[PDB]
Design a protein around this ligand. Structure first.
Ligand SMILES: [Ca+2]
Ligand SMILES: [Zn+2]
Length: 381
């Protein structure tokens, strides 16, 4: 049926094609997924947006990168949260978008919540931003007007649509920055070295946070921990939690003019005596040692977290991935050989871990190339 190019969108880790000395978030140690899709004749682009920023801030950045222009976070939103209204300036990867072009988004991890929110803003705008604009006589980003539907279909991989319990870990703060550290390591990048090039830009202009000359990432992360991008409600950290994801689900709905596709991942085995889930062999070392124990055993009746939630891919509960449920009116149906419009098409669950699926961690039985080509083909169908 269609011609749409594909835009790749990372999660709460992630970086541009030139960052990390060319080590690709999409493809990691296996290769360059964008290159493969392009070689195969599927036109593909990569967005880079603040890994730790809220989905709102991320969707605003994404809008700017796509159509070109200066990031506008909304004057009501920036006033409420205490950060800059305008951010950086982009050329635009897809100027055709201005004349009725369309796209497909392939989104990993938190990128899936962002892709959802982008769609919902494009279609509906923000009532709150429209009113704050009229009321204080300031300018409004066209992102907030509504009526701008240009995303034809959204595909999510290992997305915490309902939040992930990782956030409830007692040392979640130190362990989450340890993961940024791990993803760094997998790119042959030290955390105790004060690099002179950017390497990994967290894109915190709006918070006025930037890494300093002679500052290592270890040192940078300590500061980040104490900044509003870790401690405010306007953070990846918040939209990632269970209550945070459910809040997003209350206003971020499936558009009827988009097709939605979900892929779940798992890398655990159930223990028969405990009913706990444990990391399979070959699961990435950091999630194996640090995150998966906790994820496979944390229950919390007040949060409605029971045995359903224990299966996981090393970072996100598997139950969370098939589509938003908590606080949502979206429909989820299992893939029947056809992609239905306006609902979540549950493409099933793959025995792959969170970082193996984008190839950041090796997995020789996972045929990452055929995986992505099949996705590309399905989107074109
Ligand atoms: Ca592995
Ligand atoms: Zn913000």
């Amino acid at each position: 049926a269609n011609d749409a190019p594909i835009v790749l969108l990372h999660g709460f880790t992630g970086w541009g094609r030139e960052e990390m000395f060319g080590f690709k978030y999409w493809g990691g140690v296996r290769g360059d997924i964008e290159q493969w899709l392009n070689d195969n004749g599927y036109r593909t682009y990569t967005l880079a947006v603040g890994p730790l920023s809220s989905n709102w801030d991320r969707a605003c950045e994404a809008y700017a990168q796509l159509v070109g222009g200066t990031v506008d976070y909304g004057a009501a939103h920036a006033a409420k949260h205490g950060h800059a209204r305008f951010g950086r300036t982009y050329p635009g990867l897809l100027p055709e978008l201005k004349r009725g072009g369309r796209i497909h988004i392939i989104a990993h991890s938190q990128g899936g919540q962002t892709a959802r929110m982008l769609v919902s803003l494009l279609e509906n705008g923000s009532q709150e931003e429209r009113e704050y604009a009229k009321a204080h006589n300031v300018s409004l980003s066209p992102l907030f007007e509504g009526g701008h539907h240009f995303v034809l279909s959204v595909t999510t991989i290992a997305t915490p649509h309902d939040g992930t319990t990782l956030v409830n870990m007692v040392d979640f703060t130190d362990r989450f920055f340890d993961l940024q550290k791990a993803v760094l390591k997998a790119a042959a990048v030290a955390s105790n070295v004060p690099y002179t090039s950017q390497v990994y830009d967290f894109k915190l202009d709006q918070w006025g946070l930037r890494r300093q000359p002679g500052e290592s990432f270890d040192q940078y992360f300590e500061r980040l921990k104490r900044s509003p991008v870790w401690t405010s409600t306007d953070t990846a950290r918040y939209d990632l939690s269970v209550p945070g994801a459910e809040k997003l689900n209350q206003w971020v709905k499936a558009s009827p003019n988009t097709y939605y596709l979900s892929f779940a991942t798992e890398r655990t085995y159930r223990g028969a005596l405990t009913g706990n889930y444990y990391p399979e062999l070959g699961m990435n070392a950091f999630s194996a040692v640090v995150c998966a124990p906790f994820l496979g055993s944390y229950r919390n009746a007040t949060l409605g977290i029971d045995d359903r939630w224990l299966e996981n891919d090393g970072i996100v509960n598997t139950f969370s991935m098939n589509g938003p449920k908590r606080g949502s009116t979206d429909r989820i149906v299992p893939y029947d050989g056809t992609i239905k419009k306006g609902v979540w098409n549950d493409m099933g669950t793959y025995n792959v871990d969170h970082l193996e699926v984008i190839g950041v961690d090796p997995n020789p039985l996972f045929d990452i190339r055929a995986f992505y080509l099949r996705l590309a083909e399905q989107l074109a169908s």
